[PDB]
Design a protein around this ligand. Structure first.
Ligand code: NUX
Length: 289
């Protein structure tokens, strides 16, 4: 019997099998009545779908059917940890799950919600099907890297290195950059489904590929979106949020900056987190009324 990396049989859990024959763990939050819309939640690098419990329960409370899976190599899904043959695998698998849910709920609008690497996934998904999605909620999406982190010289060394030792690790993540909320950093550091190990250079190359692909996608992007960004984000540089606002073709685009906030805005200081929830609630409510 096929089992999650934590040894739980997939037959006990919601799942799907992707185009490469890998089992992905799925999560669903369905209202009691006919939903008004569908929304897919796209998690970030090293995390998993269970970190969106509270946001998902809020969206289900608006009578959306919320659904997610753990990306390949993440959470309770199969695959070598935090490795992907090419970044587009994540997009492909999102589209499989979206197409499965649309078949079951024909005619309902479908939204995307993406954070971090999952925001880059959401952008690329929406740019692959222009006109298809009703809207996107992006929380600190990967659009631009921290310019210090990703100099021409560090990127050219990292391509040379990846041609020899694609499995070489960077250091562990500084989880202290994720949030000013120390209890949320402690929760992240003790979550057995998070990968906080070094990133492999081959996966760092796939994140640079995502950044490249997002830039080429922005002039195709027409989908309505809400963009939430902290000013003190050391992973997804705030300059990327400005770039997405400038280059997207979307007629309906809104940015809110959280002054002083770190990366995980939905698990930040309580004033930030409460604002993030409220803004998502109003933006989705307006567009499902
Ligand atoms: C919890 C959710 C989440 F994890 F926060 C996200 O999904 C964040 S994910 O979008 C992400 C974004 C940026 C970085 C990061 O600091 N860098 C800078 C250095 N980069 C780089 C530099 C030289 C060479 C190479 Cl090969 C790569 C990449 C590793 C990447 C662009 C790291 C990550 Cl993990």
């Amino acid at each position: 019997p096929r089992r999650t990396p934590q040894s739980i049989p997939y037959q006990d859990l919601p799942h799907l099998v992707n185009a490469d024959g890998q089992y992905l763990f799925c999560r669903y939050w369905a209202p009691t009545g006919t939903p008004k819309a569908l929304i897919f939640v796209s998690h970030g690098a090293g995390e998993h779908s269970g970190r969106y419990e509270e946001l998902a329960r809020m969206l289900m409370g608006l009578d959306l059917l919320v659904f997610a899976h753990d990306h390949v190599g993440h959470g309770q899904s199969e695959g070598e940890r935090m490795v992907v043959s090419d970044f587009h695998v994540f997009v492909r698998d999102v589209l499989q799950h979206v197409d499965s849910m649309q078949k079951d709920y024909p005619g309902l609008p479908v939204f995307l919600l993406g954070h971090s690497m999952g925001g880059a996934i959401a952008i690329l998904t929406a740019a692959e099907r222009p006109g298809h999605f009703a809207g996107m909620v992006l929380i600190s999406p990967l659009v631009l890297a921290n310019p210090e982190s990703a100099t021409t010289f560090k990127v050219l060394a990292a391509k040379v290195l990846n041609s020899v030792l694609p499995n070489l690790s960077s250091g562990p993540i500084d989880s202290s950059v994720l949030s000013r909320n120390k209890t949320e950093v402690d929760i992240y550091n003790s979550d057995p489904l998070i990968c906080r190990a070094g990133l492999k250079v081959c996966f760092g190359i796939q994140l640079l590929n995502a950044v490249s692909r997002v830039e080429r996608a922005l002039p195709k992007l027409t989908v309505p979106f809400l963009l939430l960004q902290g000013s003190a984000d050391r992973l997804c540089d705030s300059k990327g949020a400005y770039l997405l606002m400038e280059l997207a073709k979307s007629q309906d685009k809104t940015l809110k900056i959280y002054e002083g906030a770190y990366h995980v805005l939905h698990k930040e200081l309580p004033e930030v987190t409460n604002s993030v929830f409220h803004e998502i609630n109003m933006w989705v409510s307006q567009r499902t009324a």
